[PDB]
A paper describes a structure:
An alternative way to improve HDR editing rates is through downregulation or inhibition of key factors involved in competing NHEJ and MMEJ pathways, such as 53BP1 and DNAPKcs (NHEJ) or DNA polymerase theta (MMEJ).
We first screened individual and combinatorial saturation mutagenesis libraries targeting two adjacent i53 residues L67 and H68, located at the binding interface of i53 and 53BP1, and identified amino acid variants that were enriched in the GFP+ population relative to i53, in particular variants that introduce a positive charge at residue 67. Of the 19 new variants tested, one (L67R) was found to be significantly enriched relative to parent i53 (L67), although L67H was borderline significant and was also moved on to subsequent validation. All recombinant variants complexed with the 53BP1 Tudor domain and exhibited increased binding affinity relative to parental i53, suggesting a correlation between the improved affinity of the selected variants and their enrichment in the GFP+ population in our screening platform. Next, we quantified the potency improvement by testing a range of concentrations for editing HSPC cells and found the variants induce a ~ 3-fold improvement in potency compared to parental i53 protein. Indeed, we found that combining both inhibitors resulted in an improvement of HDR larger than that of L67R or AZD7648 alone.
Residue numbers in the entry:
A (entry chain B): -3 to 74
B (entry chain A): 1485 to 1603
The structure:
């Protein structure tokens, strides 16, 4: 909630969406947020950051992706 | 008359503005927009900035090589093979970005509305 961070997600259609995520959110939770906003079922979603796959069970922080509030990662669906 | 023009446009109340082109003036104060990344949707006229290219010293958000968006300032542009590149400075350093890598936050785009808003 209060300490959430902005991320971007590029979908297969070329649309980029934003999400607010907790440093602690799991990848599954990120996929649920993408479903909730954009309608893509989690079973279709495979997320990557900078060419590396994001595993179910990890947070973005488990990948050292979230920085300060100045820099916002772009995740990509593949 | 706006058909065919390059613009930067958002599709949500608090969203970011993305580069694209108007392909049609449609009903109810909306315009069909083809975004440069291939997304097409109808957008409200109030959410369109008719600025092409984004002017010097505009504060923008740009996608760096490391796959982070962050703020920068436009310092130049280059047209090569029909494509536009922006020179944007971040933390004192300039790099070149494709047009489609340069977006505007709500605040950044609101700064441009008085001069470049449609309508």
């Amino acid at each position: 909630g209060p300490g959430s961070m902005l991320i971007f997600v590029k979908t297969l259609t070329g649309k980029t969406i934003t999400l607010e995520v907790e440093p602690s959110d799991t990848i599954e939770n990120v996929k649920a947020k993408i479903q909730d906003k954009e309608g893509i079922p989690p079973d279709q979603q495979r997320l990557a950051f900078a060419g590396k796959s994001l595993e179910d069970g990890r947070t973005l922080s488990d990948y050292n992706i979230l920085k300060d509030s100045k820099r916002h990662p772009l995740l990509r669906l593949r | 008359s706006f058909v065919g023009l390059r613009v930067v446009a958002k599709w949500s109340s608090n969203g970011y503005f993305y580069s694209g082109k108007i392909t049609r003036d449609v009903g109810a104060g909306k315009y069909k927009l083809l975004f440069d990344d291939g997304y097409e949707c109808d957008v409200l006229g109030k959410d369109i900035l008719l600025c092409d290219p984004i002017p010097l010293d505009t504060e923008v958000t740009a996608l760096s090589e490391d796959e982070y968006f962050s703020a920068g300032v436009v310092k130049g542009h280059r047209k090569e093979s029909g494509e536009l590149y922006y020179s944007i400075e971040k933390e004192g350093q300039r790099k070149w970005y494709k047009r489609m890598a340069v977006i505007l936050s709500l605040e950044q785009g609101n700064r441009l509305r008085e001069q470049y808003g449609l309508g």
